[PDB]
Amino acid sequence: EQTYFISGANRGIGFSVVQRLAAKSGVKVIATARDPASATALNELAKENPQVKVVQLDISDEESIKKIAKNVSQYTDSIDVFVSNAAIAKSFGPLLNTPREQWIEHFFTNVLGPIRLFQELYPLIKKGTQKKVFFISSNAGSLNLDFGLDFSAYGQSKAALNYSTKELARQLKPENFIVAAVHPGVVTTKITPEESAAALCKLFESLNTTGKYLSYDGTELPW
Amino acid sequence: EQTYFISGANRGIGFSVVQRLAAKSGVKVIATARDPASATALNELAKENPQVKVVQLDISDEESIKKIAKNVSQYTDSIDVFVSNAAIAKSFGPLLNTPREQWIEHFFTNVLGPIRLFQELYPLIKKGTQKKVFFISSNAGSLNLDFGLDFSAYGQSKAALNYSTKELARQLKPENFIVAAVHPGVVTTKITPEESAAALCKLFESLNTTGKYLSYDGTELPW
Numbered sequence: 001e002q003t004y005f006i007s008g009a010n011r012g013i014g015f016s017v018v019q020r021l022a023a024k025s026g027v028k029v030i031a032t033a034r035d036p037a038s039a040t041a042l043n044e045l046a047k048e049n050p051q052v053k054v055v056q057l058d059i060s061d062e063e064s065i066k067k068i069a070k071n072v073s074q075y076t077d078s079i080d081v082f083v084s085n086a087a088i089a090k091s092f093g094p095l096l097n098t099p100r101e102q103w104i105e106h107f108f109t110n111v112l113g114p115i116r117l118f119q120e121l122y123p124l125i126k127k128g129t130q131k132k133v134f135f136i137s138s139n140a141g142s143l144n145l146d147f148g149l150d151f152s153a154y155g156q157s158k159a160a161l162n163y164s165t166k167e168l169a170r171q172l173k174p175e176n177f178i179v180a181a182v183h184p185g186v187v188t189t190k191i192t193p194e195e196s197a198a199a200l201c202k203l204f205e206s207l208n209t210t211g212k213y214l215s216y217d218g219t220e221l222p223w
Numbered sequence: 224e225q226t227y228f229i230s231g232a233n234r235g236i237g238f239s240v241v242q243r244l245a246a247k248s249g250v251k252v253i254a255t256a257r258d259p260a261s262a263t264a265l266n267e268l269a270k271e272n273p274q275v276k277v278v279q280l281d282i283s284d285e286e287s288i289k290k291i292a293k294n295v296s297q298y299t300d301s302i303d304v305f306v307s308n309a310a311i312a313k314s315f316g317p318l319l320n321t322p323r324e325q326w327i328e329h330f331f332t333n334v335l336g337p338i339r340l341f342q343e344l345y346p347l348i349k350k351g352t353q354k355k356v357f358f359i360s361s362n363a364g365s366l367n368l369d370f371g372l373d374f375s376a377y378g379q380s381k382a383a384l385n386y387s388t389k390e391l392a393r394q395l396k397p398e399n400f401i402v403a404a405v406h407p408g409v410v411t412t413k414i415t416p417e418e419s420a421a422a423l424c425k426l427f428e429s430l431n432t433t434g435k436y437l438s439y440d441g442t443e444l445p446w
């Protein structure tokens with residue numbers, strides 16, 4: 001049996017990934033929401049597929065993050081595949097027009113959030129078999145891609161986490177960890193939440209090497 | 224007649240840059256320190272060289288940033304060359320060993336501070352002739368250099384500021400701004416702060432192209 005963990009599983013790609021793992025026999029899924037009582041679709045998913053456990057997590061909330069380890073410890077002694085999915089994307093366009101609170105929010109939510117989450121759940125990942133670690137990044141977070149758009153605090157935060165993902169990959173190679181930054185696609189060319197999920201589950205299962213920055217099709221991105 | 228702005232001029236590269244600029248004719252220098260009262264060497268520079276103006280700046284402090292434009296404005300009507308030199312380097316080594324507070328402090332001081340500082344000083348810069356905007360970054364901020372060292376929050380913060388620098392270079396090209404990120408060298412191969420300052424001041428005067436990630440010697444670094 002493998003244990004998957006997905007932050008931000010109440011909707012978007014997160015929900016779709018959990019929805020697909022529920023169909024994989026012998027998969028336990030720690031799925032998170034910041035408000036699990038209001039996660040209608042997810043709570044349904046989990047009553048009909050109770051291998052799905054719904055845990056509370058606000059990745060912007062250090063007090064929430066300080067509890068994620070015991071919350072997950074209620075359901076599992078290990079994580080095989082960790083997916084930092086939960087993130088925000090609220091601020092684009094010019095620097096001169098990006099106010100303080102926007103820079104702050106994307107940092108706390110999109111960088112510190114995942115770094116703390118990972119720090120907390122490292123012990124449970126370390127006791128698992130697969131030792132696979134996925135940060136859902138964005139192609140917008142590359143220092144070497146030009147989309148003809150400014151991504152403001154969004155892009156900066158994905159670039160910051162990518163930097164730290166690269167380092168983590170280096171640092172955990174001796175422990176046989178597989179660490180990746182993954183662009184899941186752009187979802188509603190735009191691709192469906194279900195299409196992104198399908199590709200992410202394949203990539204999650206297929207990835208055998210660490211320190212990669214991958215798009216959902218499994219092709220590499222420049223850092 | 225040119226005005227330069229240097230953040231963090233009480234010691235290190237910043238002091239050596241102000242010292243180098245104070246020696247050239249027609250160069251007014253607005254030099255900043257968190258605590259000017261104790262900036263002995265800088266104050267003695269200013270006492271003899273009245274083209275050197277000292278002002279308080281804590282870039283970690285929104286209430287200090289809220290004052291820098293009006294305070295710089297008492298001493299000058301414009302900035303030709305903006306140099307965001309002030310910064311910290313307190314956090315290195317592995318991701319799992321870097322506590323929350325190091326990630327935060329490096330964000331606020333090394334990302335948000337310079338960004339906010341630039342926002343406040345842009346008008347003064349728009350009104351000057353040279354329209355040159357330098358972020359002192361690190362080769363440690365590259366997403367594409369491996370030094371076999373962990374740079375933790377320091378490196379993450381120079382990478383994040385690099386991402387936002389490259390975007391700013393794109394945004395301000397229509398207004399004929401020159402925006403660069405500049406590695407000043409490793410200072411105590413090691414170069415001295417006076418060697419770094421000599422090279423940097425050369426680069427500041429000569430760079431006529433926006434969007435560069437450069438080393439003190441004018442050679443390019445990969446983002």
Ligand SMILES: NC(=O)C1=CN([C@@H]2O[C@H](COP(=O)(O)OP(=O)(O)OC[C@H]3O[C@@H](n4cnc5c(N)ncnc54)[C@H](OP(=O)(O)O)[C@@H]3O)[C@@H](O)[C@H]2O)C=CC1
Nearest residue numbers: 008012013057058059060085086087136137138185186187
């Ligand atoms: N799809 C795209 O266009 C692209 C997306 N990505 C990445 O894919 C991932 C998924 O994005 P997407 O599905 O579009 O996102 P959504 O806009 O659908 O919502 C993001 C998810 O994160 C949750 N979330 C937001 N803030 C917090 C928080 N503070 N604590 C916990 N959970 C939180 C949301 O729950 P809640 O309902 O409460 O907000 C939701 O599950 C993100 O990392 C995103 O950056 C990358 C490339 C482009």
Ligand SMILES: NC(=O)C1=CN([C@@H]2O[C@H](COP(=O)(O)OP(=O)(O)OC[C@H]3O[C@@H](n4cnc5c(N)ncnc54)[C@H](OP(=O)(O)O)[C@@H]3O)[C@@H](O)[C@H]2O)C=CC1
Nearest residue numbers: 231233235236257281282283308309310359360361409410
């Ligand atoms: N040293 C090196 O080899 C390298 C350095 N760099 C970068 O070059 C720049 C200069 O480095 P270096 O001279 O060696 O650094 P130092 O640490 O010697 O000096 C840093 C300067 O920044 C000021 N500063 C620190 N925190 C704040 C704050 N909150 N508000 C305002 N000013 C502040 C310091 O003031 P105070 O005296 O009050 O602390 C000081 O004037 C930095 O951006 C650094 O990251 C990049 C790579 C290589």
